[PDB]
Design a protein around this ligand. Structure first.
Ligand SMILES: Nc1ncnc2c1ncn2[C@@H]1O[C@H](COP(=O)(O)OP(=O)(O)O)[C@@H](O)[C@H]1O
Ligand SMILES: Nc1ncnc2c1ncn2[C@@H]1O[C@H](COP(=O)(O)OP(=O)(O)O)[C@@H](O)[C@H]1O
Ligand SMILES: [Mg+2]
Ligand SMILES: [Mg+2]
Lengths: 217, 42, 221
């Protein structure tokens, strides 16, 4: 049976500094185990794990962010999606994901970097839901006066419990590689653009994310 | 640091203090020690 | 004095991910060398040291760009300049103490329109520079007043100052007099934030005497 949902995190510095603090400390402890190669190796492994955590946070929050305040802009949705797709294209390969893009050059008002971040987080989740093969569908249309972007995957899907918790800060099913912060920023960005989001999913079958945005002239 | 043994965790704590590692790093270790209900070893 | 130089009211840096990922990648790479096979103690020590220096770099970029940034997109608000300044001073008090810098603040609760995190980031970058210009003592003065319909935020130090050529280059991406610990990205950010707030900046500086940064912002009513 399919289900559908209709729609505190730490500051960015705290979120990134936490793992970097841990990595720095364990790196410095390596030389404090001069007789135990296994303890040195464990320290190094933890440090690397924490550095990978930092990298995951950067991916979720800062993939496109530039060191300058953004200004709201008329965004060509087709072009923005294509660039995000180009970035995730190597990730779709290796995991055998077929990207099918039916797009239209409609315009919405937003901030380019944040909008790209929002799109990346949704699409990356879709690819990660299909670890050993699948199909990624990106579709642009007008739905009752508004720009509809829907992102469908044939992946692992979500139960009702998981789906209702989707976007809750730190909720993840991906273990150490998960942050549970990617969808949270998707929601925040969509809200700021005066949009809405629907997520339909069924376990083992897949997930469809529907983004609704006001049409710009 | 959830996979460190109790033994290695405590060992790391005292070694961090000797080197004067970051107070923030020492606090992370202490919090892990507290989580494991092992503060009586500190 | 006669060496006084001024920058009157009114290119190209890496994206934030690129700037942080460069040192992070290097740090991971060096620790990976230690992890993947047993190395001799001299190489482990060296690789760990380089990794830590690269983590120092990441932390400097985080400081310049992301000290206050929250994952939620910001909305402009009515900002109490006294409260915001006090928050920034609180954060920098340990650093000032470590350089024997005393902080003198004369503040008033005047209001400006802006985005809180960015405004705080802007103030921190200027005050951190002020403290860094005074490595062996001095006074950080922070003054808030009204000047002709504008809020004036004045940040003065008694530090090393700048030549004509250095003040001209201040805010140029990657320009720094601080060598290995410098980023040259702090002021770049300050100018872009103040600009977005419809403000202006005036700087007076004199070698061996110090620097005064004046930020002017529209008064919110
Ligand atoms: N397309 C999807 N298919 C299946 N599960 C998903 C999908 N998108 C999100 N989820 C679930 O929601 C959780 C939170 O997502 P997110 O906030 O991006 O964090 P992360 O991806 O780091 O786990 C994921 O761990 C996953 O269980
Ligand atoms: N208060 C100050 N006193 C003296 N020099 C300053 C001051 N503020 C900025 N500068 C000069 O401008 C340069 C660039 O500043 P900034 O962009 O913050 O980079 P960083 O502080 O990383 O060097 C500094 O390296 C310094 O030479
Ligand atoms: Mg995710
Ligand atoms: Mg600086």
């Amino acid at each position: 049976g399919p289900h559908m949902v209709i729609r505190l995190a730490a500051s960015i510095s705290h979120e990134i500094r936490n793992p970097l603090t841990a990595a720095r400390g364990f790196i410095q402890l390596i030389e404090e185990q001069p007789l135990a190669a296994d303890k040195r190796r464990q320290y190094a492994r933890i440090a690397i794990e924490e550095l990978d955590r930092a990298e995951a946070i950067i991916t979720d929050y800062l993939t496109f962010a530039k060191p300058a305040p953004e200004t709201p802009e008329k965004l060509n949705v087709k072009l923005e999606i294509e660039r995000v797709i180009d970035i995730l294209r190597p990730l779709a390969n290796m995991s055998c994901v077929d990207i099918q893009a039916t797009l239209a050059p409609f315009s919405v008002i937003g901030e380019r970097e944040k909008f790209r971040q929002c799109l990346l987080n949704v699409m990356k989740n879709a690819i990660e839901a299909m670890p050993n093969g699948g199909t990624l569908q990106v579709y642009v249309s007008i739905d009752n006066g508004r720009v509809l972007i829907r992102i469908a995957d044939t992946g692992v899907g979500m139960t009702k419990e998981q789906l209702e918790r989707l976007g809750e800060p730190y909720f993840t099913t991906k273990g150490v590689k998960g942050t549970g912060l990617g969808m949270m920023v998707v929601y925040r960005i969509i809200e700021s653009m005066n949009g809405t989001i629907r997520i339909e999913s069924e376990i083992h079958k897949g997930t469809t994310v529907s983004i609704y945005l006001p049409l710009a002239s | 640091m959830k996979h460190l043994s109790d033994e290695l965790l405590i060992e790391s704590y005292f070694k961090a203090k000797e080197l004067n590692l970051s107070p923030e790093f020492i606090e992370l270790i202490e919090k892990e020690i507290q989580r494991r209900s092992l503060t009586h070893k500190i």
